[PDB]
């Protein structure tokens, strides 16, 4: 569960950083 809030679009889950995930709405979190 390491991830940090950071406000930062994805277009998908390697776009973000650490465990953390690209949710639908298009955002990491």
Given at each position: ?29
């Amino acid at each position: 569960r390491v991830c940090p809030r950071i406000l930062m679009e994805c277009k998908k889950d390697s776009d973000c950083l650490a465990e953390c995930v690209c949710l639908e709405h298009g955002y990491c979190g």
